[PDB]
Amino acid sequence: PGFNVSQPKNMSIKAFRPPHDDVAKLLKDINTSKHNLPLANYEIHAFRRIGLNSSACYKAVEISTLIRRCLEPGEDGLFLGEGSGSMLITYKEILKLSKCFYNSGVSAELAPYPSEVGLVEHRMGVGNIVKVLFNGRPEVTWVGSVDCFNFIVSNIPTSSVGFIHSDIETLPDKDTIEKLEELAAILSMALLLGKIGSILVIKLMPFSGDFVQGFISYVGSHYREVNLVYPRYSNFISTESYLVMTDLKANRLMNPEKIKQQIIESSVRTSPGLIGHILSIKQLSCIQAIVGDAVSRGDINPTLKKLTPIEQVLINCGLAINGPKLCKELIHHDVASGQDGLLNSILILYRELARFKDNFHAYPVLVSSRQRELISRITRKFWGHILLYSGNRKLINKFIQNLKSGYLILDLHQNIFVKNLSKSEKQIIMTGGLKREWVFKVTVKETKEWYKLVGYSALIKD
């Protein structure tokens, strides 16, 4: 079904406001539009370089630019499905919340504490507990069920919290009724446990044929001001947005099932025009579209060379640069980084390949199965030496064009670092029937890691 000019209206901000739509004007614009009439860019991971497990904190700061005037220091807050709690750290710093609750989802220690919050309280100083956390039993959490709603209602003190946030990941094969039950549970918790000045933020990823638009038109009644926010640091190919609801008018107790029946009787099942409108705004106002594409013609943007001011807002009392430890996981490079990593260490693998030939045994099979493995290591490390320290002319562009195709190419010839090898060892490598070309396919996750490594090589070239 998938086969455009429509524009929207301490720690100093408002230089980072995201595009937001008022809900009713957007709904009338989609309903009046006739529309009809009959990729996979991952460069957005180049700009995210703070946050080790998760780098979503950028989004959080932009959302805070619409929250901070509408809330006082609230000393409250409930967070659902944080996933290592990086956004919790960012929102707790920027909104001065005293206490924080954390739900997530538990797969059967049995008390899963967030890793990034633990690293933040370790690096900041002496931090005790910070977040309250829940039981950790499998029936506990699993938002969208009876036990979750009963356990969360039984704990939060009877309409006390002021900032409610949901960041549940939606799978592509998730059923729409299950997602509607989850959103109805979040809404029932928001009405029962939320006060008058409560602000609710829900991460929504609409699809064609989903029940998202009926839920949005339903939730526009209880909250006086409902807006839909497209963060600038999100991936523009994905249709993710944040629904922000402010100034709840009343607190009532109703079951999620009655809410679900009302949304089904509403019979609104989204439009292709809404998906196209979200995609158009996120393409026009992405962070790539405002300061330029990072790959260019084999050159890094000057904006990524020095730390951007959003990263300077983040780095004060929040997270750390994820460029280190990424080299350790990817190219096995030390943190000290005085070219002791790579260089001679790369040569060490060649020294192994110097004596690997050794010229009723396991010679024909296993030797090949080892040889490729060694070459694979060299391949990754060689691209590291092009990205991290060497010059960018005629090689970074080739690396990006090969990565977009999906392959990493290493050529075993005169090349680079073979001149440092011994003449006998160079003769041993060249003599055999090795192809002088070796490709290795990369996955999507490794491509994201390589784009982050480009983003950190930008800081190293500074």
Binding site: P1, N36, L37, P38, S145, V146, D173, D175, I177, E178, E181, S208, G209, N255, P256, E257, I264, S267, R269, S271, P272
Partner: protein, 114 residues
Amino acid sequence: VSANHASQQLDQLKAVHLASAVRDLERAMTTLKLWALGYSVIMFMITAVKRLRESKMLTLSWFNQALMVIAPSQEETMNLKTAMWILANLIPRDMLSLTGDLLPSLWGSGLLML
């Protein structure tokens, strides 16, 4: 067990039974079919069933797109409208909420004469 949990599990079970019915119907209609490219009353049919096999729902906008692509041939548009009426008759009225928006609208319409 509360009524809400039982209702959720009942909806999941109805979805599983509907998926099994769609798979068996697709196999039957493919077996019937295999023994210009203007499609007819069954060549239309399986396409909608194929959308039900790949877990994407029947929608009014899809019907408008399908009318616009088949627009020069009026007999073929009649064939596709009759085929969606066949699917309205085959699927029980409880599960038309699961299929989408086309079939609850087409359940009301009926033939004037045999």
